[PDB]
Design a protein around this ligand. Structure first.
Ligand SMILES: CNc1ncc2cc(-c3cc(NC(=O)NCCC(C)(C)C)c(F)cc3C)c(C)nc2n1
Length: 267
């Protein structure tokens, strides 16, 4: 079952995005701010199954680091999925607009939240397939929650690219990329390299270099997420455990990995 909301309780205020066959609005629910995704007239059977299926999954999950469902409008048209509203929006854009404004402890806290959400999804037998900072939302407490706005080569594990093997372990690879995104304040993974250049580089053993001002322990962890051999990657359980220990003994984060400068200025 999913909480059914009457349309009279919902007010759409502004368009903030696009759905698969409909739009996404900021609005109010009788009052609390909400995000609202619509499915407009003409939708196919597949679209309806996918839309209500997504809502169903969201309504069963209950975790601090997973987007919360307020409810669904299924009995009237257009159909709607209504979620909590995350005031700071998508993590990738947020970090790029707030470059350098957070402490290392705050950044690592973000990652621990994301990891906790992913551990929950993985153990509930849900494989994300598109984990990236663009699909993480941020609220006014700086809490990060896993979402999905709809192959993204540079986030995807080799086995998922090569033979379509998507698992919690391919999500761990992606999480490594997300760690690099957070610690660089939203740098594009692999910079201007083309998709084929990225795939070639990874196959030949290249990995993203240390971010600036990055704790050694954090760089070590993201490198383990990028083991070629799936079985050698940490589980989300391991990641949550390590990040929790680092945060609870925060002097552990004061030791930095060496940053490899591209340009050296001699004065
Ligand atoms: C800008 N703030 C904000 N806050 C909250 C927002 C919530 C949504 C949202 C997102 C989804 N879907 C969605 O989050 N799917 C993944 C769910 C899972 C992690 C449990 C597997 C949805 F079905 C409906 C809506 C309204 C979207 C598309 N945008 C949002 N934007």
């Amino acid at each position: 079952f999913t909480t059914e909301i009457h349309p009279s309780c919902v007010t759409r205020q502004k368009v903030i995005g696009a759905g698969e066959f409909g739009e996404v609005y900021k609005g109010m629910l009788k009052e609390v701010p909400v995000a609202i995704k619509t499915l407009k007239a003409g939708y196919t059977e597949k679209q309806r199954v996918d839309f209500l299926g997504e809502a169903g999954i969201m309504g069963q999950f209950s975790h601090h680091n997973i987007i919360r469902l307020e409810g669904v409008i299924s009995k009237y048209k257009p159909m709607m999925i209504i979620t909590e509203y995350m005031e700071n929006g998508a993590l990738d854009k947020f970090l790029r607009e707030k470059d350098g404004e957070f402490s290392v402890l705050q950044l690592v806290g973000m990652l621990r939240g994301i990891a906790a959400g992913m551990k929950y999804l993985a153990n509930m037998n849900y494989v994300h397939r598109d984990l990236a900072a663009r699909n993480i939302l941020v609220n006014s407490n700086l809490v990060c929650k896993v979402s999905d706005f709809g192959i993204p080569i540079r986030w995807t594990a080799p086995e998922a690219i090569s033979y379509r093997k998507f698992t919690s372990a391919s999500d761990v690879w992606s999480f490594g990329i997300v760690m690099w995104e957070v610690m660089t304040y939203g740098e594009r993974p692999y910079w201007e390299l083309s998709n084929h250049e990225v795939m070639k580089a990874i196959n030949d053993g290249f990995r993203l270099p240390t971010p600036m001002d990055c704790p050694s322990a954090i760089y070590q962890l993201m490198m383990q997420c990028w083991q070629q051999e799936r079985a050698r990657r940490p589980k989300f359980a391991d990641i949550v455990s390590i990040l929790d220990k680092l945060i609870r003994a925060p002097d552990s984060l004061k030791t930095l990995a060496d940053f490899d400068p591209r340009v050296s200025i001699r004065l």
